Amino acid sequence: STQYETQGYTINNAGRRLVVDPITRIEGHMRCEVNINDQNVITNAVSCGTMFRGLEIILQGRDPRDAWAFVERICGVCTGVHALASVYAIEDAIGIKVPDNANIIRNIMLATLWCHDHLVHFYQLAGMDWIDVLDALKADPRKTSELAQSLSSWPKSSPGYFFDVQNRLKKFVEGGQLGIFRNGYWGHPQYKLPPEANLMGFAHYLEALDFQREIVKIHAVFGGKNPHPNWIVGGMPCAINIDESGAVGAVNMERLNLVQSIITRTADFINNVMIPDALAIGQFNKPWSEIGTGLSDKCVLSYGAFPDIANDFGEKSLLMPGGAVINGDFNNVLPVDLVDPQQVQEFVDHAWYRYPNDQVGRHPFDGITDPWYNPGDVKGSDTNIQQLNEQERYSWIKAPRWRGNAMEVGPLARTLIAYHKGDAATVESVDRMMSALNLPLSGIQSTLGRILCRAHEAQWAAGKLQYFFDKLMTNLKNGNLATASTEKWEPATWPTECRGVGFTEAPRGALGHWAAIRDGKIDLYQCVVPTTWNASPRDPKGQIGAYEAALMNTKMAIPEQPLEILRTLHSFDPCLACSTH
């Protein structure tokens, strides 16, 4: 066993080793290992991506116009965000400017995804870490109605409703076929909600499972389908026709009416179901404002997103701010440049890849994806990993750093950047939210905080959907219908050699696609995706990523039942297919 210091942490692999494989209630394949000391406190944390597909290799030789369709399939959970980054990247390489309506519709696609993804994560993925579903069977339906009505104007709150939900659950469990509830952590002492709050939460889990299907109707209108909508280089393919013959063959007034009806219902559900539930989880789990801080009080990163001025990706255009904080200095939000080779770099000394020199980090325009499964001694065999060897290569996830710093990305990172750049809406929302919980600002830099920030982002995005829809309708009123630029659709119009970056803020954090085009085809396509940052393995200096840092120093009540580990990992909303691509 060894011990070393990094980022204020003592990394110590003495003591009992615990393995959590598979991690569930995530997208894709992750393994986690920890060591715990004699006080059952984590002294070592190991994040491992247990899948790889190789989209950066598959994209070579494709037509740049087809790239979005391939890379969209990086992930069906964050569906669409890789398509958006792809068309941005190709447009940046070739020098294409899209019409305003295309930009607006792309912003609608992204806000729709934020709403949908954050909602499903809250209930279906993270929810059962905080809601003891079986304990709901003990709730009094009238007290449940009373609790719900105290927290929200939401209509669906009758005692009869909560009895009916409880009875449904009782009948489900009675025959022993507990399905997704089988062999859960129910009754663990870290479940702190009273029975009435567990029944309210469970009822909302079911309401959210139903309602989330509606949100993506917006993606069906503009993008044909969800999951995995369609896009084009040059704008969007959903041509508009309001008042001419053949409007039946296009986005028309009836299609836009459908979109508006979805936006309203989406805001109403998030504001009156998700938001109060998130605040309730906070009220009943305040000690988790002090657990899982990790890198969130040290180093956070946003590239920014939602350009409101079409084809302008600068600070005055992006509605979601970009910037970096390092060394815990939130008074100096630093500018991020994705072309600068000294900024974003990826290491593979602790990952299953080959570089000519594994001690140096490669900017994505110099990126290499040469898979090399080489786990070393893992106390088993190459096909039987009993214990990862975190002194050597232990993951299919590359290790991104920013100016050599290990960063956290995602909703909490974004909130902190916007807050400290002085975004007024963000300051007021954050201050009001922490005031309501009677917690200091620092309480946001936590596992609880990640959940709170995610819910507040769903609210933000639902508001922006309306703003963007109104912008589109203003252009239509003014007779501005254009949805595609095709001046540079034909490969004969492109530079022989060019490269470009497409970037955005996906639901999980900062996303970039770096593309080099030569002779009409993709020569290089490198992706660095938010869970790549957060779930990163170590680097040549031994620095730990966001997941490992957030797990460090965490008490476990019951070692064999990894609820604390799940709570903190799920708070980051891991998408492993994204991380590895």
Added chain:
Amino acid sequence: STQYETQGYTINNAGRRLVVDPITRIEGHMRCEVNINDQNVITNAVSCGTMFRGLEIILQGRDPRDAWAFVERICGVCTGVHALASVYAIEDAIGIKVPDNANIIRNIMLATLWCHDHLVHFYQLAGMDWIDVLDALKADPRKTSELAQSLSSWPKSSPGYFFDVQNRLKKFVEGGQLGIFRNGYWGHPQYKLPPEANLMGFAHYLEALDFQREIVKIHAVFGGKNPHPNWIVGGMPCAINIDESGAVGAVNMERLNLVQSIITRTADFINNVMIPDALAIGQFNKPWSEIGTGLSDKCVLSYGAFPDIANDFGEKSLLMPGGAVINGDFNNVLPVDLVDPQQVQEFVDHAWYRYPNDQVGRHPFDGITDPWYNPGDVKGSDTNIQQLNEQERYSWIKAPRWRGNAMEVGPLARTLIAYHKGDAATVESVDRMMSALNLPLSGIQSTLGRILCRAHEAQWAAGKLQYFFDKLMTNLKNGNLATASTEKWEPATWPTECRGVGFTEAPRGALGHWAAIRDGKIDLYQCVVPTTWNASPRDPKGQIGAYEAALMNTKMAIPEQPLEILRTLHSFDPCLACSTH
């Protein structure tokens, strides 16, 4: 002035005349006149259909296969019921037997219509006679929540919801644009609900307006569209294919799944919203259990409906019983035969038509539709009527009688027939309903009763939807897919001369279409429709129809405000396009 006695009434047209023209919150065109005495009690009532189109004349010379499509357009409110009667009639004439699945699907179409039509009538047509909408502005939202929750398990009951509904109404009226609420009867002393019940009812009005659009999705799956779905002689055109290539072109498992989803939601809304509201109206308006009895304690008529044994229209097959009661003898439910010339007859001595002898009635196989606008000695003129002359011709509606008796038809009529025939489910439902109100069985023979029975029937029909659906699925599991008989589709296969009767129970009562075919073409097509019975003018004996009887003896608080007249008329759910056709 004159006075005469009929059916236990004193018909006296001395004294003040009141005119209500137009009747609103009905389908189509109706005029009502009454005389009231010094005591503000109605001593004479005059029912006038103020429209005519002449479908029976238009059908002459048409192909029998087309007839359903023309007669469907008798009415877009009871949409589909005339199509059903038509295919039944033509199939009866020609000798066509349809496959079981076609019969089951037709039963589904009819039950769907009962649910939809009853629900809309309750809220949108009759509701504002009972619910004081402006009084809902005075309610307390918490007391409204408490009331709703005391009556129902329905989820949507939070104080915040009722506050939101109230504020929507408050905003609606704040600009002085009261729309459908303008110049209403608000504040009239016969409005008896407390403010909280008014706000509860008004919230439900809005929920029903939204929800009714879903119910008719069942019509769209099997019949293409609603309003006015499609049908065929020989069955239905909605071919089924569950497990073969090209199921995407037919009623397949996904289409059936949509139907099931609508059936469950329909039952839920009726059982937990409409049913408790009907009972609540009963609880607050018990005196209306003794108002508007009319013919309902003397003569009631049902043809019966919903044949469960395909192509068998007998007593053992019809799920909704048929029968007639006269002379108030509910111990003698009499069989109805629609071919017997001495049973159903129509008189026109007081209607705008020509007969060779207007002192006798004509069975519909001998029917004549020869319009003659002759209002005679009106107050005013023939193009400017101040008062109809009820001693002569005063209506576009013919006067149907059964064995010379004036009958009431519709949900109360059916309920009485089924109750007195000993239908266990009907007896249980009625007994439970009247027990909850602490009212005698006789309390159903009333204006309030007509509303309670209509709600009852919506529940009944929602249960039958599931029963029929299950029957269909049972056939499909057994490989029984057939939906049309075509061996007699071509005209050369028909009898050179034949006639037939198609009958059913529409939402408003007993419907029949009598058709004669000769040489491939419709020779005669006569319709007697439920509102024709209820809104009937007088006959040569001076006998009054159901609406005129139910209005007799009614007290009015404020002669200039016809609230009591509207309550009673609306309780029958008048469809004037139906009545006149």
Added chain:
Amino acid sequence: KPRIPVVWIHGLECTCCTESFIRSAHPLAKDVILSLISLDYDDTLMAAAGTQAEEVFEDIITQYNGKYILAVEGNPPLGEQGMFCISSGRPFIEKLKRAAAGASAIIAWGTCASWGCVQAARPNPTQATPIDKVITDKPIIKVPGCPPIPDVMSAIITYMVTFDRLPDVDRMGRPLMFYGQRIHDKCYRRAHFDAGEFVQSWDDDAARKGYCLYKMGCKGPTTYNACSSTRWNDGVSFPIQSGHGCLGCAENGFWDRGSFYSR
């Protein structure tokens, strides 16, 4: 801010267009009524009857003279001095003319108001006559169909309110947006038409595979509407999708073009 006044009157009709309107999925008819328009007169839905309804009519057309939209469902009969359709003891046509005179624009909902529909089919006993043969001095927007599609009706309303203009129309006064193309020009069974793959009798193997309905009398090739694209009842179906040929119900005179089952 005030909502646009709408006066909805009914001649000879079956009320299908009214029912279609309330089916609207987006915007919901509830929201159209509460938030988008002021539905100031409507026999189907209004609280007031009789003399109170007459007062509403008179007050609205007077106070908002020149400023309301007039929606007409149904048609006036010219037979029997108009008394085949009576309102307030007088021919309906007098109400139509009074309402029309104060309207900024007129929407003819459905085939009845647009062309005649079933009451005008041979032999037209009442001499039912479409609105534009009586009202000759005002813009009439024809929205035909029996009834028109619910979300078409609400889309036309939202267009007028959002864009503050009438929809552009074809030479017959039909909105281009929804009536510019034929049913058969956007029909998902066109593959089968083009291949000669036809239903020949109901519930044959062709019918069970969704083959073309042309030999069963489908009039989609001569009918302009949005049924094969927008579809019906929140996109759930349309006539052809559920196995019946188009009747031609959006086209002038469609009842008297021969049997629905003939070419």
Added chain:
Amino acid sequence: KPRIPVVWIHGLECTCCTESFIRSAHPLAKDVILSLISLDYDDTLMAAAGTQAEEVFEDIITQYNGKYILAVEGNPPLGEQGMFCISSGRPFIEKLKRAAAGASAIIAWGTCASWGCVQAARPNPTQATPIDKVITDKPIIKVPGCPPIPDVMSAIITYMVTFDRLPDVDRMGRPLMFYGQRIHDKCYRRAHFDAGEFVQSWDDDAARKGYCLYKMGCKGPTTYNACSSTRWNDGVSFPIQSGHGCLGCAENGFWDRGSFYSR
């Protein structure tokens, strides 16, 4: 009354088919899980993780040996001794084979499980391999598409539960009910294809009238699925309806049949 046990495993995948499943409109995914099946193992949704999830897996396949349906999303990679996809420290393929041995039948959801999908596109770095090339002694129902249509997924489940049988399949193991016909055989723009009425460049006048997308690379003529009939997301749209050609996403090898914008 007991519900049919379902074990859902995930190989290399993007999880789009799981997301599609939960979009189901009728039956709602909620009702599928609570009332129609017993979803007894599923990495995406299950409470238990790690050793607890391993215990569920082992108990279910043992207790219900011969009696559960195995749903598979994604595929096994044969490269690096299978360790391009690791489950409880061992190759995913081992878990696949264990789960398959006890299943009464296998549903291969999506193009990944059916054929390979994007990870199998040239040059297939991981040697991703479809389930039927590894499991060779069990009934496998291929439900391809990237992802398949939500209401198609739920319709297949309901069929299996209601009818107590597997859907009948084509020669490739795809359910005839939803894969028997081509997209282009039920496409509402086929009129335009027949007339030579094509979009030539994005947002041209043809595109704004809903013309055929064949010259923009639409692969509808060779693709079998229900998208042009059943459509997507409760019938709201499908790729072609919103202006993009079909990519061919239900067909084996579709990523490597040339540019989506070429013929």
